[PDB]
Design a protein around this ligand. Structure first.
Ligand SMILES: NC(=O)C1=CN([C@@H]2O[C@H](COP(=O)(O)OP(=O)(O)OC[C@H]3O[C@@H](n4cnc5c(N)ncnc54)[C@H](OP(=O)(O)O)[C@@H]3O)[C@@H](O)[C@H]2O)C=CC1
Ligand SMILES: NC(=O)C1=CN([C@@H]2O[C@H](COP(=O)(O)OP(=O)(O)OC[C@H]3O[C@@H](n4cnc5c(N)ncnc54)[C@H](OP(=O)(O)O)[C@@H]3O)[C@@H](O)[C@H]2O)C=CC1
Ligand SMILES: NC(=O)C1=CN([C@@H]2O[C@H](COP(=O)(O)OP(=O)(O)OC[C@H]3O[C@@H](n4cnc5c(N)ncnc54)[C@H](OP(=O)(O)O)[C@@H]3O)[C@@H](O)[C@H]2O)C=CC1
Ligand SMILES: NC(=O)C1=CN([C@@H]2O[C@H](COP(=O)(O)OP(=O)(O)OC[C@H]3O[C@@H](n4cnc5c(N)ncnc54)[C@H](OP(=O)(O)O)[C@@H]3O)[C@@H](O)[C@H]2O)C=CC1
Ligand SMILES: CCCCCCc1ccn(Cc2cccc(N)c2C)c(=O)c1
Ligand SMILES: CCCCCCc1ccn(Cc2cccc(N)c2C)c(=O)c1
Ligand SMILES: CCCCCCc1ccn(Cc2cccc(N)c2C)c(=O)c1
Ligand SMILES: CCCCCCc1ccn(Cc2cccc(N)c2C)c(=O)c1
Lengths: 254, 254, 254, 254
């Protein structure tokens, strides 16, 4: 039960956002939810979305994770507006569609470092700031993909970013363990999201999952949300630096 | 919420049993619980224990996992007495204290194969039978230790048994995925159990955990129970073939 | 260069044996080679094989790894006949074709424990004895398959055995590190061997390898032999407890 | 035997450089060696070093891996001066000593992205260019550390860079498998190098290695070189996307 719990959810873009699947679940558990977005234009569509939730007031903040300030300030503000929080969900990442199509060896330096910045570092600084709002401790969860652990056809630069992220988690988990903050990640299966749109051979994989994954099916944002809850809750106390695959156990086969 | 859910808990020896830490948690969630023991003499002490739970009736069955029958029959009987179940918790293992003290290379063939039998195979056959009581599917969880993934001083033969077990889980998870049965494992941190008694230097490790583990503390049977619940519940739907470390994130460091 | 080096090669059944691919390579490096076989009937075919090698004398010993003695004695004898050795190659394993076809959950206890015995334990005892012939230290290598790390369709019980083996290596590596003995394993790609014959969907995999493996091709006994040499030689000094995938990098993808 | 083989060695700073330990070994095998350095001032000290090798002519090129051009041009030039090559050794990495001392969560964005750039991306672009000099294929090897796989006290940001690198390898290995180029990495144990100087907790670890590592000792640049040779040679044909721990098997314990 998540009453008296307040979580920050970063990275909602639409009803298909994975971070939304999470929100639904948390909301359904009576958690007070706070949200962050990148561009203004999103914000309206956003508020439109919230209405499907039993959130008394809508607490929306605009943070683009590339700006040290937008993050530092953004959080401080939340600290002022809602006080302390219990945890953060991090559903943010980016890469140039080019660098995902081209051969990986052709990947550009900007494209590379960019993905590293948004998809991995963001977590570090976010944690550092969120820490300030979790005096008695709390839980942080980030979203990764199997391509962080293996070379996945076409995932290219994003793969390396995820790999980087998955390590980020461990180092954070260690750094903040003492401050009683748990840091874990969810390796999600492929899901039909905004960003999932436009990727080559996506549909192929979804099918290969059904055909090969132990559960012979695919996963959804809710299932992720559920695991997310486990992780954000005291249920997963004692679990830190872990990466949980919510992917029909596709990770376990070969 | 675990009303209308019925789980079989194997491997309770006492109040310090990990499997007991699990039971408490499940009971506290309104699950109907069934138990199994190896020797009669335990059974009394056992009933004595249950009394701390809000279990209407006590359903205790005697199964030594070395006997193909005791298992086949034991389960069938449960099927008759309680009908279908939602899952099974497997907290069973054994190894000869000799083989854990001696150099690993000196390990005897019996000692070796014995541990494999009780600590790993047991799961396989248990799953096969439990399957019959989970028509609409369900969840199976086994308990492993970090020593299944790395050579841990002194864990010796038990290490290899766990390794074996952790693979057992994956192969099972794959085999029974279609039948909608999830199979996962919990890599527990060191806990003061009956069997934990008598192990060389154990106390050293417990301390090293506190000193090195991200959370700078140790874990208990409850924390495991909690994760166990996550895994046994529909919360962990979409998670199969996974090994979750409930160990203060000690698994993540080096 | 492998003159003045003497290695024991266990598990040759024919010209297609992986252990043979190894032998060729070692022989080609001037190593003195010793061999072991299970049944008499093999021995003749064996001697027939050796003739393709520049081995002055043929040193063949009969050891079935299920017999504690055949191993203890077998080695002692070698110790008497050839004195000290530099290392051992272990290309032995077994499982019942039944248990590989049936669902994994249906696996029989004998079938299970049998595979564990031959495919994993064998190593332990072999090491213990070979140790006696390597006073200044040496190198031991065993052969595993990817299915020890992931649930591979149909590998079933053999998978778990390999998993067990891969751990055996680590625990041995640790145990004998001080005695300056390195213990490592080769995760080989699928190769057309005697035992490879009769397995379901084998041909499928070989193709999937070519199509998906980074090298877009398959591997042979020689390539393994080559890596084997690296491992058995002082080249791989400082490497112990490692598992090297000679599989066109298939292990690295997903 | 490495006659008729030409390899590019990047990242020599002094006689203690790991890349130097490699060079010695390769030179000792009759390989034609090409070198790269970052700053001019190094170059002299460098030529001074070469003299210890049986290299007919010294082929030294200046490439700082942060410049897309210095790399593109640098290689093209080599292509003109020495024609085609057989492979590349990558012994380059950097991170700000600050970010390694501070808590990881405090890591600055520049510091972070910088390490990613030099320590990981560099490989990608280097590969892309070196590819052009390896028409019939070849082998690329990079140097990583255990902290890429686990949170290692103090390794902080460099850890994440290595993690990133280890993924880079896999994705490259896959991308260039078809062009018959193998890409692998060496996870080296701690070694007393120029850069190793100034790290906190260094001497401690070196000792913990001796005390805990299976081989109960430490490793040197040569041992690495040796494995490097295995990897760069046709010996490791069939091995790609692999990470080999040359660390006295410390990786295997816990
Ligand atoms: N979809 C899938 O199959 C998988 C997804 N994941 C991961 O899940 C997470 C969410 O992806 P998903 O929900 O699928 O789809 P979404 O694209 O809906 O969510 C991603 C969010 O990231 C936001 N974002 C991007 N860059 C920044 C930035 N610099 N600052 C702030 N926000 C930013 C986007 O905002 P906007 O559009 O408003 O800019 C969007 O809200 C990511 O970490 C992704 O890697 C992992 C494995 C599989
Ligand atoms: N304690 C720890 O620190 C750790 C424990 N674990 C694992 O957690 C699980 C629980 O162990 P733990 O709680 O430590 O101690 P427990 O002794 O409570 O649990 C082990 C149980 O196994 C039972 N058992 C043994 N052999 C058989 C058999 N052939 N058939 C049926 N039951 C059998 C024992 O019953 P009886 O005495 O009646 O025979 C005992 O109740 C085990 O799988 C263990 O390996 C993992 C990591 C660390
Ligand atoms: N083939 C492949 O694709 C792969 C094979 N491997 C591994 O490589 C190794 C060699 O298999 P492979 O060479 O392919 O095929 P083989 O069948 O030619 O070799 C297996 C060997 O095991 C021996 N053996 C079996 N039981 C015993 C025993 N009790 N005592 C002594 N020797 C015994 C057999 O001897 P005999 O017939 O004389 O009893 C035979 O020489 C095995 O460990 C296998 O697991 C790993 C990955 C892939
Ligand atoms: N030392 C250890 O224990 C371990 C080291 N490693 C790795 O081994 C590699 C070599 O480190 P090591 O040999 O230990 O010590 P060194 O510091 O002697 O070598 C590092 C070299 O990298 C060069 N370099 C750094 N940045 C650049 C750049 N931008 N462009 C070109 N060259 C650059 C340096 O050049 P210069 O000074 O001339 O500018 C120097 O020659 C690194 O990748 C490191 O991460 C991995 C595991 C353990
Ligand atoms: C080529 C394999 C495709 C696997 C699909 C899983 C997936 C789908 C989407 N995303 C998000 C993503 C991927 C690539 C670029 C961007 N910007 C974003 C937000 C992921 O990180 C991962
Ligand atoms: C060398 C470190 C000791 C391991 C501490 C954690 C632990 C404690 C107990 N057990 C259970 C165990 C260990 C040894 C023998 C037996 N029979 C049993 C049931 C484990 O598997 C593991
Ligand atoms: C289901 C995937 C098949 C993978 C083939 C690779 C392989 C081929 C042969 N062997 C040896 C083997 C396999 C099966 C049964 C037996 N007895 C033996 C000795 C292995 O352990 C592994
Ligand atoms: C607390 C763990 C210490 C491990 C020392 C091993 C090591 C020693 C040196 N280096 C190179 C290094 C380390 C730190 C900063 C920089 N710039 C560089 C190039 C490594 O990447 C790794």
């Amino acid at each position: 039960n998540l009453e008296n719990k307040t979580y920050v959810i970063m990275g909602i873009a639409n009803k298909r956002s994975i971070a939304f699947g999470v929100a639904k679940v948390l909301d359904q558990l009576g958690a007070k939810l706070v949200f962050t977005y990148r561009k203004e234009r999103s914000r309206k569509e956003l508020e439109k979305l919230l209405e499907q939730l039993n959130q008394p007031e809508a607490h929306l903040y605009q943070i683009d994770v590339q700006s040290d300030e937008e993050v530092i300030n953004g959080f401080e503000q939340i600290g002022k507006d809602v006080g302390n929080i219990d945890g953060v969900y991090h559903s943010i990442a980016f890469a140039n569609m080019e660098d995902l199509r081209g051969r990986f060896s052709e990947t550009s330096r900007e494209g590379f470092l960019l993905a590293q910045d948004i998809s991995s570092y963001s977590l570090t600084i976010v944690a550092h700031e969120a820490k300030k709002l979790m005096p008695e401790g709390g839980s942080i969860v980030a979203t990764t993909y199997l391509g962080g652990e293996f070379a996945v056809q076409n995932y290219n630069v994003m793969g390396v970013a995820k790999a980087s992220l998955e390590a980020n988690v461990k180092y954070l988990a260690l750094d903040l363990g003492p401050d009683n903050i748990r840091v874990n990640a969810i390796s999600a299966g492929p899901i039909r999201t905004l960003s999932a749109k436009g990727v080559g051979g996506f549909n192929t994989i979804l099918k290969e999952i059904e055909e090969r994954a132990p559960l012979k099916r695919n996963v959804d944002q809710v299932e992720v949300g559920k695991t997310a809850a486990y992780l954000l809750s005291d249920l997963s106390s004692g679990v830190t630096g872990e990466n949980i695959h919510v992917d029909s156990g596709f990770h376990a086969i070969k």
